[PDB]
Assembly symmetry: D3
Homo-oligomer: 320 residues x 6
Amino acid sequence: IIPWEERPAGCKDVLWRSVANPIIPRDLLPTSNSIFNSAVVPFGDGFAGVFRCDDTSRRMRLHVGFSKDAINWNIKEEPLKFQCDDEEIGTWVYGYDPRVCFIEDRYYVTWCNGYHGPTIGVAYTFDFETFHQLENAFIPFNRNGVLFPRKINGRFAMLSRPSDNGHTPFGDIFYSESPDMEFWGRHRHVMSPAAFEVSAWQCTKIGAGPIPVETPEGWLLIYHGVLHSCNGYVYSFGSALLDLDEPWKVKFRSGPYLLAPREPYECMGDVPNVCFPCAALHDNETGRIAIYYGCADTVTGLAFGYIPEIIEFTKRTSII
Amino acid sequence: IIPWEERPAGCKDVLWRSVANPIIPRDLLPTSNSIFNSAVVPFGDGFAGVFRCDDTSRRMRLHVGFSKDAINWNIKEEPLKFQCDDEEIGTWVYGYDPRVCFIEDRYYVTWCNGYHGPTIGVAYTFDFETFHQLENAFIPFNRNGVLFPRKINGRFAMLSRPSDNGHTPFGDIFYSESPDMEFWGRHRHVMSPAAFEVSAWQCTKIGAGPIPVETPEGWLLIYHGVLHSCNGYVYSFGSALLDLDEPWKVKFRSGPYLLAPREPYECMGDVPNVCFPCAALHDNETGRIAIYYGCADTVTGLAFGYIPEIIEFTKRTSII
Amino acid sequence: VIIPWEERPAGCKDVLWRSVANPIIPRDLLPTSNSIFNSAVVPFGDGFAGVFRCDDTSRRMRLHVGFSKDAINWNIKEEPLKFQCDDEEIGTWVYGYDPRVCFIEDRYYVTWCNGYHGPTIGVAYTFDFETFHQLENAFIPFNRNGVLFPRKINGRFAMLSRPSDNGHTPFGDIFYSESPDMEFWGRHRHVMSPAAFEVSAWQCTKIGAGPIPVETPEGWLLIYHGVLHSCNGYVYSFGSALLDLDEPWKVKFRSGPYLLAPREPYECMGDVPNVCFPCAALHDNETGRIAIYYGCADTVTGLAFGYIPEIIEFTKRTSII
Amino acid sequence: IIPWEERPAGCKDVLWRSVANPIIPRDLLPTSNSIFNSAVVPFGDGFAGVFRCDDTSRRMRLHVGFSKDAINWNIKEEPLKFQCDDEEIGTWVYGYDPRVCFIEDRYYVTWCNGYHGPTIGVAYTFDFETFHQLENAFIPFNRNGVLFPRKINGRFAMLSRPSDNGHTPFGDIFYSESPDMEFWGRHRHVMSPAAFEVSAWQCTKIGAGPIPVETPEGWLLIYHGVLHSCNGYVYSFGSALLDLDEPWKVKFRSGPYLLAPREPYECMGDVPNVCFPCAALHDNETGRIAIYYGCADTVTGLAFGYIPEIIEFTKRTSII
Amino acid sequence: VIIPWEERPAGCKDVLWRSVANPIIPRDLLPTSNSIFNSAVVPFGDGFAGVFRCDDTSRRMRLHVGFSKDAINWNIKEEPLKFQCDDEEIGTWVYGYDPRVCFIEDRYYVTWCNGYHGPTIGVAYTFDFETFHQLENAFIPFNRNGVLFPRKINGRFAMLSRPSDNGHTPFGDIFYSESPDMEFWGRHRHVMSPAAFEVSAWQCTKIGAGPIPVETPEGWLLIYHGVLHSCNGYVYSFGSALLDLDEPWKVKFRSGPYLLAPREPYECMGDVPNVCFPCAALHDNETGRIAIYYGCADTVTGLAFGYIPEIIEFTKRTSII
Amino acid sequence: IIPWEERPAGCKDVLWRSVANPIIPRDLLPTSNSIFNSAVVPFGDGFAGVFRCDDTSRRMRLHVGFSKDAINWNIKEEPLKFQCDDEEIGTWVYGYDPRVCFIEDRYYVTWCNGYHGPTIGVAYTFDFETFHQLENAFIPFNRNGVLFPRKINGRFAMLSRPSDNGHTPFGDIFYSESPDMEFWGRHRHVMSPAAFEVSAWQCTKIGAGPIPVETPEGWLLIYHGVLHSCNGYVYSFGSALLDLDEPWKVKFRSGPYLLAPREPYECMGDVPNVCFPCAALHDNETGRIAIYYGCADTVTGLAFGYIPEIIEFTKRTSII
Ligand SMILES: OC[C@H]1O[C@@H](O)[C@@H](O)[C@@H](O)[C@@H]1O
Ligand SMILES: OC[C@H]1O[C@@H](O)[C@@H](O)[C@@H](O)[C@@H]1O
Ligand SMILES: OC[C@H]1O[C@@H](O)[C@@H](O)[C@@H](O)[C@@H]1O
Ligand SMILES: OC[C@H]1O[C@@H](O)[C@@H](O)[C@@H](O)[C@@H]1O
Ligand SMILES: OC[C@H]1O[C@@H](O)[C@@H](O)[C@@H](O)[C@@H]1O
Ligand SMILES: OC[C@H]1O[C@@H](O)[C@@H](O)[C@@H](O)[C@@H]1O
Ligand SMILES: [K+]
Ligand SMILES: [K+]
Ligand SMILES: [K+]
Ligand SMILES: [K+]
Ligand SMILES: [K+]
Ligand SMILES: [K+]
Ligand SMILES: [K+]
Ligand SMILES: [K+]
C-alpha cells in the first residue's frame, strides 16, 4: 500500500506536497551531506530503494535503503558496491541520480555513472543485497537514464538525455531499445525543450524523472524541466503521455508544471530552486500516485496525486 | 489618498518597507505563479494598474487590476488584450514590466513587448477597459521603457534601456522624444552604471523604475542597479535627480541604495535577491511617496518615504 | 554616367565576377592609412565621389572623402571628414565606420556606424561633397548597417538597419524604419533573420544590408552580407534578396546560395581574414549592368560585376522563400 | 594500383605531400564551394568514393565519385540519396565527414548525420550506385565514426568520438561493438587528448581519421588532433597502434605529428590551418600507404609514407 | 588570554560546532553597514582587537578597526581605517577586503586584498590598532587570500597567497612566499591545488587560506576555504590541512571532508548565499581549544568551536594525501 | 657591428623590414616546427642568443644559438637545459619567449617558465654554454618578463605582465626591483592598454618586447599591443619612453604602431597576424637599431630604424 495523504481542503492542484516534507533529512547517515534524487520500489512486505547520498567530502555515492511505510527510511551507512566481472566497467569513479524498476524477473538500477564522463550505468539485483553491474548502456555524455517497467514489443527500452561534460545548457529526451541489456539501438528523439513563449518552465532542458507509469491512455511520463533565469536554473516538473507501442511518440504534453520550487526546503539548500523527481509508487485500483523528488539537491520530498487527474490535466493543457 | 505607514520608531532609513509585505501574493489568480514588477496609478475614486502575472506555464502576461486602497488588488483573471489596427504590431508574443502614467488627457502604458525580441510596446487607455496599441517606440533590443508624466518642451518623452536578447550583462539609461507618439528621436544618453569602486550596487547595469516624479529642482528618478556577485545578480534601487528641461542631464545620483534585498520575500523565490521598483504613488502636499517593487520576481511589496528626504539624501550622498 | 565594367570571363558561369584589377584600392593609399575598405560610392558631376572608411596606423576608424573619374582609380583626401553640427552633444566625434551614401530628392545623404555611447547610425547630408551637415543619430545604440533607400517610400524617408550589441555581435536581423523629417524614426518592421544553417549556412549567424537598395520593376534589389561561424571565426559572404516595392520589409525572394564569398588572397588574408563586405554599387538601368564595391579582409577594396536581370533570375530560382 | 610518389631527395619526413596537391579542387562541381573530407576505396578495376562537397549555399552533402587512378576524380553532380524503409531515420538534414570500407560482403559508409544533432549515420552499398541506410549507430552527440574493415572476434566494431552540438572544445576516441550493425555496446575509451606539455598538437581534442589499417603488430590508427591557439584551432594528424584483438588498448602513440598545416592550401581557405585525414589506400606487399586529407576545409590533398616506417616512428616517439 | 568557548553539544559528533549565538556580528552594526564578514581578530592588551571588512550601503569595501573584551561582543569604529604611507602611489586607496591579522615578533601585521590596478595583497603594521603604517604591496596583481605566518620561518617572514584574476576567479592554488624584510618577496612555492572532484568536491574549483596558520607539534594547522561549482553558483566550505613545520609549502595531510559547510539560514541566505568563509581563529594550546570566525553568506559573522587535537586527528584520518 | 640595411629611397616609415625576411626559417632544426620570439645579444666577436623553438610535438623549448653577423644563425639542435641547486625550481615543464641581457658581470636570461602555470623564470650565464637557474621572479601568472640592462639605483629591475592561465584577454605592463636577483618588490604599474577610440592596435593587452634601450631622454621601450577582431588577435608593436630614474613613469607613448602584420610570413602561419618583438641590437654612435620579431609564431624577421627618429615619432604622436 502506497504512502498517501488526502488532498487538502480547498486545494485545487493536481499534485499536493506531503505535510511531512522533507521525508528524508540531509543528515540521516553519519557522513551524509545530502540525500536526494533517489529511487524507490515495492519489495517484500515493504519498500526498497537506491539513494543518492552525497557525503561530507561532496562525493556522490549510492546507498541501499529499506522501509516498511515508504516514508521512514533505513539507509545503509556503507555505499553500495557493484559486482562486475569486467574490471574496466567495474571501476567506480562516481554515481548519481539512480532510477530502479522491476522488469520481468529482477530489479534493474540505472544511474549516472562516471566512465570518462557521465554515462548510464546499468545493474540488476534479485534481493537488494548483491548488485551485478552490466555494460554502460551508452557512450558519454548522457544522464537521466530511465527504464520502462516491461519490455516494449519484446525489447528492453530506456529513456535518456544526451548531455555534455558540465552543467549542461540544453537537453532533449531520447528513447532506445535493447534485446539483451548489453547492446542498445533504434535511438529515437522523444521531445525537446518547449519554446519559452509557450512553456518557459521547460525551455532550457528536460529529462525523464520517475519510471514511466503504464496507463490505458499511454505511458505517463513525469519529467523535469529547466528555466534559465539571470541567477541560474529553476527545476520544475510536469507530465506527458507517450504512445504505448512506440513510446518515442508523444501524444500529449503539459503546458503548466505539476510542481515548482516554492517551499523553503525546495528554495534553499546546496542548489536552490530545485524539484527533481526520481521515483513514484502508484496503485491502479485507487488511482493514487506518490512522487519522490529531490529538493534543493539537499533532502527528499513527497507529493501525491491521482493518475486519472494527472492524465486529464496533461491532455486538457497539452501544448501539442 | 495614498497608502501609507509611518516611519518605524527609531528608523533612520530614508525608505522603509511595509510591515505587511508582500502586499500582492504570488497566487492571487487561479493560474498565477508570480505577480511582480507592476504598474499602479490613481484612477477615479481609487486605483488602477497593469500587472505582470507570470502563469504556471511561465508565460508572461499583463492583467488589469483595480483597487480601492492601492493595497488589496482585484486583478482580472483574463490577460489584457490590446486593440491595434496594424496586424503585424498587434501580434502578441509576450509582455512584461509595464509602467503606466497619465499624460495630459489619457493613460499611457509601456511594457517590454516581444517583436523579434524585446522592445518597448506602447498603448493608451482612458478607462482601463479598452487599450489602443501604438507603434513600438524603438527597434529591439530595449527594455525599461518609462514615460515622463507630461510633455517636455511640447514633446512626449521616454526613458529606455538598450539591451540584448539574453540576460543582458550591461545597461545604460537613455532618453528620447516624440512629437506624436509614433516617431521617436533626439536620443540622449542619461547615465551608465557606476564604477564598482564607487558604487557597486549599480555597477553592472541600471534601468529606470517608476514614472519620473516632478520636483521644483528636477525629476526624481528611482532606478534599479545590478551588482554581479559570484552567485548572480543582486538588484537594488536608488535615486537620482535629472534636469527639468533636459532630463538626460543628471544633477545628483545616490551613492548608497535606497533599498536592497534583505527580507526572505526579497531573497528567496523564483529569482533570488531582487528588489525591482516599477511604480510609485505620491502626494506633493505631504511629500509622501509609496513605491511598489517586485520581490524575488515572485511577489510585490511596498516601501514608503518622503520626497524631500529622498532628495536631500540623493544630493548629500551624490557620486556626481 | 559611365559605370565601370568588365565583361564576364569567357567560360564563366557565375552571376557575379571579380574585376581582374582587384584590389582596386590599396591599403596604403594615404600616408597614414592602415586599410581602406567598407566604403561608399556614387555618381557626382562628370565622375564619381565617395566616403571611404580609412583606418589609420593608430587603428582609429575615420571617414575620408574621395573623387574619381572612372570609379576605379580614387583620389582620397588625406585629412578625415569632419561634420558640421549645431548640437555639440551629437556633433562630438568618437569614431565612425562603414559609410553608405545616396542621393535623396535634393542632396546626398551619408549614414555610418557612429559612436555615441556605443555603435549607432549616424546621419548627415551634403550638397557638394565638401561640406557635410550632421543630423540626429537615427536610433538608439546598439545598431549598425544603416542603409537608406534612394527615394521616399510613400512620402517618408526609409532606412534599413541592424540591431547589434557592443562587441563582435553574434546575432543580427535586418530591420526597416521610416521618418517624415530625417529626425524622428518609427514604424519599425522586421525584414529578415539569419537562415537556418541546414538551409543556407553562409547567412546563418547574422546578416546586414550592404549597398543602397536598387529599385527594379520586380522590387528592391537588396545586396546583403551574411556570416557563417566556423571553429576559427566568421566568414562574411554576400548575396541577394528582392523586397516589395511599397512595403520593403516584405521579402519576396531570398537567395539560397551566396553571390560572392572570400576566395582570393586579398579576401582571405589581411587584417580580418575571410571577409567580403559589400558597401556600395553603381548600376545602369539601360544596360542592366551593376558594379558592386566590397571590403576585402578589412584591408582593401574590390569590385565585382554582374547583370541585374541575371541577379534577379538567380534570386528567384534559388529562393529559400 | 595505389597512387604513389617516392620520398623527395633529402627528405627525412615519415610522410610527404604529393607535389600535385591539391588533388581535388574546390570547384569541381558546378555548385561546389569545397570538397574536403573524403572517403576512398579500391572498387572494380579502379577506385570509388563518397565525398563531402559543401555547396555554394554552404550545405553539407555527400556525393559519389569514381577514378581510374585515385587522383583525378569524377564526382557525381547530384548529392547522394539514401534508401531507407524507416521514414524517421531516413530524413535528410545534413551530412559530412564520410568514411567507407568493405566488410565481409559489402561496402559500409558512416558519416556525421544530422538526427537532432550530430550522430553517426550508417549505410551500405554493393555497387556504389544505390545506398541503403541503417540505424544511426549512436545517440547524439557523436562524430568521427570509423568502422574496422573486418569483424573483431565476430562483432562489427567502430571508433567514434563523443562531442557536443557546437564547435566541440573536447574529444576522446571511443570504441564500440555490434553483433548485427543495428545494436551497439561494449563501449570502451581508447584515448584522450594529450597534456599540452607533452604533445600540444593533440591536446584539445582528437578523432579517428581513415579506416584502421591491419598490421601484424596491431591496428595502425591515423587520427587528427587539435591545438587551440589564441586565433583558432589548428588540426594536425598523427599515428597510434592499437592492440589487434582489443583495439581500445593503445600500444603506442606518437609524440610528434605526422603532418601539420604548412602549405598555402592548408593555411588559407574556408577554415585556416586544417589537415584532416579522411581515408587511406595501402599495399601490404610494398608497405606503401597514401593518406587523403582535407586542407583548410576547402580542397583534398594526398600524403605518402611507408607503413613499417610509420610504425617504427610511432614506437620510438611513443608518449605511452 | 581567555578565548570564547562553548562545549560541544550532547552527542554531537562533529569536529567543529557552531556557536549557539550565531551570528555574533550583525550586518547593521554601523549606521551605514550593509554587511560585516570575512574579518580578522587577535588578542590585544587585556581583550581583543580586529580589522573588519564592513561593506557599506554603496557596496564599497572598507576596513574598520574593532575592539572587544570577550571576542564575541564587538565595538567597531564607524569610520573606515586609513593607512599612513610613505609613498603616495602605494598609499592611494581604491578598495580593501578580506583582512588577516597576526602578531609577528614586535608588532601586529595586517594583510588585505588591496586594489592596485587589480587585486593584490596589501601589507601594513600597527602597535596600537589606531595608527597603521602601510608597506609595499607584497605581490603584483592578481592575488588575494594573503595570510602571514605568526613568526619567521628560518629567519624570514612567510606568507600564503592565492594567485587570481581580475573577476570571479574560477581557479585557485595556494602558494607560499618569503621575505627577509617585509619589502621584497620571493622563493615562491606551490602549496596545493584544488582537489579532483571525484575525490573531494567541496574544494575542487578553487581554494584559499583562511585564518593565520596555527603552530602544532604535528605541523602548521591550515584552515582554508574550498569552492564547489554547482549549476546555480559557488558553495564555499572550509577544511583543514597540516603543513611541514620547517618547509610549510610541503603538505603533509589534507582533509577529505569539510569541517563546515553552509547549512544554517544565515549561511544560506543573504548577499551571497551558501558561503562559509573563515578569516581568523583564536586558540589556547593548553586546553586545545580553538575558536574560528567565518563570514556567513557575505552578510554576517559567525563563530565555530573545536579542539586542535581532534582537528589534527580528523585531518590525518581522512587525508587525501 | 650590428646588422643593417639602409632605409629604401622614398620610404617614409620609421621602421622598415629586412629584405631577407624571414631570417630564421621554421625548419632550421631537424625537429623544429617553428622558431620565433627570440633573444639576441653581442657576444665575443659575434652574437649569441636564446631561441624559442617549438618542436614537431608542439612542445616549447629554448635553444642556444650563435652567429657571426646576427642574421645567419647556428642554433643547437638540442634544447637548453639549466643547472639548478633546487630540484623544485629546477624541474622543466615548458618555456617560451626568452629575453637576454648583460648586467654588470654576466648574461641574464628570463623566459616564461611553467611552474604551476606561467611565470617568469630567471637564469644567468657567463659563456652561453652553462646556464644557472635562479628563483622564479614572481608567482604565476606572469609573462613578458624583461630586465633592464643595468641596475636602477642599485637594484636589478624588471618589466613584467600579469596574466592568467589561458589566452589572456587583458594585460598591463608592470615594473619591479630586486636587491639580489632573488626577492622582488616595489611593484609599480607602468601602463595599461589604450582605449580603442584612441589607439586600437594596443587596446586589448600590451607587453614589453626587447630589453629596454637607454637614451638621454629615457628608456626606449618597444612593446607589443593586441587588437581583438571578430577573427582573433592582431599583434603589432610600437614605442614608448620611460623616465630614466623611475622607469614606471611614462613620458611618451606612441599612438601609431611601428610595425603591424602585412607580409605573407607575418599573416600566414601557425598563428596568423603576429609581429612579436623579442630583441634588439643597437649602436649609439650611429643611432642604428635592429629589432628581432616573431612572425605569425612561425619564423623570425628583422626590422631596422634610427633611435633618434623613433624617439621623435614617439614624442610627436604621443597619446600622453
Ligand atoms: O543541480 C541540479 C541538478 O543538476 C543536474 O545535473 C541533475 O541531473 C541533478 O542531479 C541535479 O538535481
Ligand atoms: O529577473 C530579474 C529581472 O530581470 C530583467 O530581465 C528585468 O527587466 C526584470 O523583468 C527582472 O525583475
Ligand atoms: O570585421 C568584419 C566586419 O565586422 C563588422 O563589425 C562589420 O560591420 C564590418 O565593419 C567588418 O567588415
Ligand atoms: O572546421 C574544421 C573541422 O571541424 C570539425 O567539425 C571536423 O569534424 C571537420 O568536419 C572539419 O574539418
Ligand atoms: O563572495 C564569496 C567570496 O568571494 C571571494 O571574492 C572571496 O575572497 C571572498 O571575499 C568572498 O566571501
Ligand atoms: O600567439 C601569440 C602570442 O601569444 C602570447 O602568449 C605571447 O606571449 C607569444 O608567445 C605569442 O606570440
Ligand atoms: K517524438
Ligand atoms: K548624461
Ligand atoms: K516569476
Ligand atoms: K518581413
Ligand atoms: K584505452
Ligand atoms: K568549406
Ligand atoms: K607542495
Ligand atoms: K605610470
